[PDB]
Design a binder for this molecule. Sequence first.
Ligand SMILES: Nc1nc2c(ncn2[C@@H]2O[C@H](COP(=O)(O)OP(=O)(O)NP(=O)(O)O)[C@@H](O)[C@H]2O)c(=O)[nH]1
Ligand SMILES: [Mg+2]
Lengths: 170, 379
Amino acid sequence: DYLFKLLLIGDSGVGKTCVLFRFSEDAFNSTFISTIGIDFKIRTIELDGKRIKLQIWDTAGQERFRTITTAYYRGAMGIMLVYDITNEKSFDNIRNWIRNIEEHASADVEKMILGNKCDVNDKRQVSKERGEKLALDYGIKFMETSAKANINVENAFFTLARDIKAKMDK
Amino acid sequence: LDEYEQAIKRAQENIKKGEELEKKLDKLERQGKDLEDKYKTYEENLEGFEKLLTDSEELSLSEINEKMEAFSKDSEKLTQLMEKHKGDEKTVQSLQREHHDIKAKLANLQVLHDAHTGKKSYVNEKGNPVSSLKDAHLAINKDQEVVEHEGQFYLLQKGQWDAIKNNPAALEKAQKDYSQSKHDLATIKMEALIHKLSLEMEKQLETINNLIMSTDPKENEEATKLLHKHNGLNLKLANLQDMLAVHRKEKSFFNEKGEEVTSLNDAHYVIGKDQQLFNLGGKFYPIHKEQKILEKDGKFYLLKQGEDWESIKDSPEKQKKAEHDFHKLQYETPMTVKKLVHHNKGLETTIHKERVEETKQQLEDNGKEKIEIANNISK
Ligand SMILES: Nc1nc2c(ncn2[C@@H]2O[C@H](COP(=O)(O)OP(=O)(O)NP(=O)(O)O)[C@@H](O)[C@H]2O)c(=O)[nH]1
Ligand SMILES: [Mg+2]
């Protein structure tokens, strides 16, 4: 048994509540129900014959709901930074999210970037290469996901857990 | 046979679904009571809001100093970045903006500090000393006073009334100074409320954590009760940010019918100062004041109000830009906090029952399914 605390952040609308709900309950709902403040889900996976309990925290994307969001950085072991591939602004803002984390979260935290809604190429605004370029500039793993199609969601969380178990084992 | 293996495991399948499904069918009786407590806690906080702008406990001197210390360690770290990216003017400018805001945040806390040392004094509407910020309309110092010529108030350097009451120009900048001071105090109050609420929320974190770790399931469920309270406080913070923004003329309140309105209480929407509420048959979208949305052949376009179909009908890339522009609107939430909460409540209440039945059928099917694999195996 380990126990990792995971934080989802990103602009409103990018799909944080949804990747959370796909990973934790294997369900997707098209209906937009905006998030008002923090909450968590729990999932225990298996890495190296060992149990890993994942305590995963959702946050509010709307500006007016994020007054104390920096206080949630405390004791997060990993942070998924989410954007929407069909929304360039949501992608630009990752820069600020990242900076905000460097200033307020431990330098030690593991960080993955997710370009969500990759199932909507018919409305794409961000190239997958801009994605990986950005992630490489900052030295953090990257991946395109869809909470709708269940693409790379297990992937993303397993990987991020891996990189924590790694650093923690040693 | 082979078949016996594929039949026993064709009921190993079915009792895997008799159990992860009957999991959901009381775990939903569960979540709906959670849903019930959640919206109840939310509504309490929302109803209790007005009655908190006036009756909230003030920031202690200790809390004031502590928040000023934190801001200073942010102004320090800001300059370090300003002088790390020296030469990159467009980020240096960005950080100067961030530094100026903090500076002003501090000037506001200093007023609060000055009043615990006064240094400064609170004064009602208008003139007379008060002890509590909730009663204050102005914060003035030792060499200033409020005079009440008729139903018209004035803020001037102490004693200088006689050098004043016969010069209208100076009568004027002092009835002006008075107004500006009432305004500044209102700003200070909202920020103070925000700081106070923040401190309270941060404290609940340690607690919430414990209840989660606690092995007692009774305690575990108590963390969720507490999260609701935490988030209720966040609803209050959201209202305040919205108020501050409108107060600073960065934003505008609008009522149910998209009429501009001055007060939160009448508001159903809150949007940018330069935005309007555009209707798409029974739904409001926040767009620029000089934009419109055009529909044609089941397509939607965000355009300058000048443009129409002709403007773009022969341009394909215009059309696609105006469609992506419209698509960005999709998950905007121009609604007011209270309204959003009522909206979300309907959506979640609807969907909960849409999961009550589907899972109820999913169990009914999986017991019908039992009458088949029991049937085959007893052969
Ligand atoms: N096509 C598609 N839609 C998605 C995907 N993920 C989320 N959505 C949709 O996009 C909207 C936003 O989802 P949501 O999870 O609520 O995002 P959020 O980041 O939680 N928003 P907030 O911060 O305001 O709570 C919802 O309408 C949801 O159905 C995805 O991968 N593909
Ligand atoms: Mg969310």
